[PDB]
């Protein structure tokens, strides 16, 4: 199986430097072009740079020339993007992709992508609060409950339920940027009313930028 | 540089419909045009390359064509899992460039939301802030009005909404509206109410609680 | 300025799709008509009924 895995993305101050890696497996990067492509609210999908590891030839987008460099280590089957003099406009998901693989003249595999956030704001871990099921969150024999993941920076956070064993009926809402400059989101799940009190429900919250990992048991309130 | 212009920006159609989206290059790109799909939480995925050729594993209901500098992507029989954004990309000249995308949504029957409300947690109340959450589950279409009232006074400027993308199983939406107050303000008022207006309801639905009640 | 033109696409078999075009009024207009003409190749001659001063269109295809 062909795979590309980006790593290295994170919060960086304007003017700062970051280095991304793109680890390839299932093919040899000597046989293809490797590209970096980014995706942002402001510019959508935007090509950044490419390299042909066989001969080392590179090309760059005008907007990153001089500030970014692309390179590759064929012995580690890995490509890199050095990112200097960073600006707000560089905030984006960075993907690596291959081109010309197996004779296909398109980008036929893309990695999951890694988020780069260019900001002077500080890292902050979320508080995780229960959304307890109650007489006000049930109807038709089913009940809603959840977790409120509040006041974190930067993105991303991940939320799962019962260590990923619970997926049916889950809605994890898009993160919202609050006026404070911090993010917040809720994740809810709908379950049988009759399961409350017998089945344990835990939301697993991870905010890697702050090394925050919370497992929150959510249950009906006391009275 | 070459620009790629995609139309329409949004297209909504029923399961089984034939849908066509378009991409225009600002100058000759030969056939060097690819189409990508991006599903919710996903990376771009290759569908069509060299204007008209289907990538391996892509369903045969997808097809592409070229006429001069005009390119089309067609889905012959729209499936629920085709709900996604679609992007075209030319690789004829450097820099390779992408279109702005076309969002494709699924039409389905009207469904009223299930409406629920959650007081601030006691845990949160230990700090100085209260979040009150109103939840609208599994409704269609997306349009919905959610208004907050506190002791019957209409609230404004102190809530935020978030809406999921269409569900993979039933093509519905869900929405959260979060009302944020100081602890002090929350403890000063009694009745917290979310009022929901939606096409599937015969009249607006109010869900409420009194602070302090179990 | 930036406007959104909302379009109903009404096909001869009664099926209905909806679409949006954004840009200046003049650009969005042109793109809507261009898209209509393209669909007309497969779905038959189109007719376009403008309402809301041009900002909403009903486009019916003859089949």
């Amino acid at each position: 199986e062909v795979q590309l895995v980006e790593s290295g993305g994170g919060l960086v101050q304007p003017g700062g430097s970051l280095r991304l890696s793109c680890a390839a497996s299932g093919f040899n990067i000597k046989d293809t072009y490797i590209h970096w492509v980014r995706q942002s609210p402001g510019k959508g999908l935007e090509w950044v740079a490419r390299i042909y590891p066989t001969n080392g030839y590179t090309r760059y987008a005008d907007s990153v020339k001089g500030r970014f460099t692309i390179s590759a280590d064929t012995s580690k089957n890995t490509a890199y993007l050095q990112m200097n003099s960073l600006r707000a406009e560089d905030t984006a998901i960075y993907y690596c992709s291959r081109w010309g693989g197996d004779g296909f003249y398109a980008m036929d595999y893309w990695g999951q992508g890694t988020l780069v956030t260019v900001s002077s704001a500080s890292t902050k871990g979320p508080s995780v609060f229960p959304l307890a099921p109650s007489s006000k969150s049930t109807s038709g024999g089913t009940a809603a409950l959840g977790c409120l993941v509040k006041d974190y920076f930067p993105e991303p956070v991940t939320v799962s339920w019962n260590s990923g064993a619970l997926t049916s009926g889950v809605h994890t809402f898009p993160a919202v940027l609050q006026s404070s400059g911090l993010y917040s989101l809720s994740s809810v799940v709908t379950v049988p009313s009759s399961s409350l009190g017998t089945q344990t429900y835990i939301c697993n919250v991870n905010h890697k930028p702050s090394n925050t990992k919370v497992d929150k048991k959510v249950e009906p309130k006391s009275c | 540089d070459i620009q790629m212009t995609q139309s329409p920006i949004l297209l909504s159609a029923s399961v089984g419909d034939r849908v066509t989206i378009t991409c225009r290059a600002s100058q000759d790109v030969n056939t060097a045009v690819a189409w990508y799909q991006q599903r919710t939480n996903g990376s771009p995925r290759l569908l069509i390359y060299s204007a008209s050729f289907l990538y391996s594993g892509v369903p045969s209901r997808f097809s592409g064509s070229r006429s001069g500098t005009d390119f089309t992507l067609t889905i012959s029989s729209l499936q629920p899992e085709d709900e996604a954004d679609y992007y075209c990309q030319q690789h004829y000249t450097t820099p390779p460039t992408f279109g702005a995308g076309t969002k494709v949504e699924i039409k389905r029957t009207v469904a009223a939301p299930s409406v629920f409300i959650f007081p601030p947690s006691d845990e949160q109340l230990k700090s100085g802030t209260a979040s009150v959450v109103c939840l609208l589950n599994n409704f269609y279409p997306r349009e919905a009005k959610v208004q907050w009232k506190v002791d019957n006074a209409l609230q404004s400027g102190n809530s935020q909404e978030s809406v999921t993308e269409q569900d993979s199983k039933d093509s519905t939406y869900s929405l959260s509206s979060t009302l944020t107050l100081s602890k002090a303000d929350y403890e000063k008022h009694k009745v917290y109410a979310c009022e929901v207006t939606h096409q599937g309801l015969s009249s607006p639905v109010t869900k409420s609680f009194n602070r302090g009640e179990c | 300025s930036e406007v959104t033109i909302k379009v109903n696409l009404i096909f001869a078999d009664g099926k209905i799709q909806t679409a949006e075009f954004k840009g200046t009024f003049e650009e969005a207009t042109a793109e809507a008509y261009r898209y209509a003409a393209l669909l007309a190749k497969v779905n038959g001659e189109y007719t376009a009924d403008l309402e809301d001063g041009g900002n909403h269109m009903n486009i019916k295809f003859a089949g």
Binding site: P174, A175, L185 | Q38, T40, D85, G101, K103 | -
Partner: peptide
């Protein structure tokens, strides 16, 4: 329509 990191989707 505008791309959102959180969903990896255009929002219109």
């Amino acid at each position: 329509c505008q791309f959102d990191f959180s969903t990896x989707r255009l929002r219109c």
